[PDB]
C-alpha cells in the first residue's frame, strides 16, 4: 500500500488547476501531507507566486501516510492529464521518496482504464512565507468579467493601474492609441450573486501591474465563478480563486515600481 493514494470523483478539477498554472510554471513540487495536496512556485520569470491547495476533503478518499514532495514538469504532467476525460475517476498514487507518480483514469462511459507512470524530477525550491496582510482594498467580482477586462486592456497597453477608492475600483491604461479605463462599482445582484461587485475599502490605494501576468492568472477563470483581487501598498497583488471548501488557487503579482 503506497504512501499516497488520492482519489478524485472527477478528473476535471485537477485538469483545470494544472491548466491554470502550466503557462506560468515550468516545474514544481506538489507537497502532499495529511491536509491535502499543495503547490507553491514562482513563475518562470520570478514576477509572481502561485499558491495552491487541494484539501483532503475534496478527494474521495484521500490518504497520505507520510509527507511526499512530487517533483513534476508541468508540460509532462499535461501530456498525461490530457488523457483523462473530465468525467473520469482519477487516482494519484506514489511510494515514499517516489521515482514516478502513478495516475489511473477510469472512464465513466465505457470499460476503459488509463494508467500512467510519470517520471518525477528532483526540484530544489525554498518555501516562501506568505504573511498575514490586511489589504487596503479588495474587490470580489465575476471571474469572466475580470478575464475580459484584463485581456481587452492588454490589446492597448502592457501596464494597468488599479486604483481603489470611494468611487469604486478603476483599471486604467495609457498607450499609443489613447487611454482606457474600466470602473467597477459596489453592486448587488439578488438573483445572480456571482455578478455582484463587493468592494471592501480600508484605505485608498493605487498600484500598477503587468497585464500579461493578470491575463495568465485568468486561465483559472473556469475554476471559480468569482475572483477576489486584493491591493495594498508595499505588497504584491493577490488574485484569489477560492474553490469549494477551503481549497484555493492564488496568484501574487509583484507591482511595477
Amino acid at each position: 500500500a503506497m504512501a499516497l493514494e488520492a482519489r478524485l470523483e472527477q478528473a476535471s478539477i485537477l485538469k483545470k488547476v494544472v491548466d491554470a498554472i502550466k503557462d506560468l510554471v515550468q516545474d514544481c513540487n506538489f507537497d502532499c501531507n495529511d491536509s491535502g495536496i499543495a503547490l507553491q512556485a514562482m513563475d518562470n520569470s520570478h514576477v509572481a507566486l502561485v499558491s495552491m491547495m487541494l484539501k483532503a476533503e475534496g478527494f474521495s478518499p484521500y490518504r497520505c501516510d507520510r509527507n511526499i514532495a512530487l517533483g513534476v514538469n508541468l508540460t509532462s504532467l499535461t501530456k498525461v492529464l490530457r488523457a483523462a476525460q473530465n468525467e473520469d475517476i482519477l487516482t494519484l498514487k506514489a511510494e515514499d521518496a517516489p521515482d514516478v507518480l502513478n495516475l489511473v483514469f477510469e472512464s465513466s462511459e465505457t470499460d476503459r482504464i488509463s494508467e500512467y507512470d510519470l517520471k518525477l524530477m528532483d526540484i530544489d525550491q525554498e518555501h516562501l512565507g506568505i504573511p498575514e496582510t490586511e489589504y487596503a482594498a479588495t474587490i470580489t467580482m465575476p471571474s469572466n468579467e475580470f478575464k475580459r477586462i484584463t485581456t481587452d486592456l492588454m490589446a492597448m497597453s502592457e501596464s494597468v493601474t488599479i486604483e481603489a477608492n470611494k468611487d469604486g475600483v478603476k483599471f486604467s491604461c495609457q498607450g499609443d492609441i489613447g487611454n482606457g479605463s474600466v470602473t467597477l462599482r459596489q453592486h448587488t445582484n439578488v438573483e445572480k450573486p456571482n455578478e455582484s461587485i463587493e468592494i471592501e475599502l480600508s484605505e485608498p490605494v493605487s498600484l500598477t501591474f503587468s497585464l500579461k501576468y493578470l491575463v495568465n492568472f485568468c486561465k483559472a477563470s473556469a475554476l471559480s465563478n468569482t475572483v477576489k483581487i486584493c491591493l495594498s501598498n508595499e505588497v504584491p497583488l493577490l488574485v484569489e480563486y477560492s474553490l469549494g471548501g477551503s481549497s484555493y488557487l492564488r496568484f501574487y503579482l509583484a507591482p511595477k515600481i
Binding site: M42, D43, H46, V47, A48, L49, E126, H127, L128, G129, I130, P131, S210, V235, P236, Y252, L253, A254, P255, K256, I257
Partner: peptide
C-alpha cells in the same frame, strides 16, 4: 520597471 517577487516574501 517590474519588481521581482522574491523581495516581498521571506524564506522558510
Amino acid at each position: 520597471q517590474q519588481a521581482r517577487i522574491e523581495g516581498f516574501f521571506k524564506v522558510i
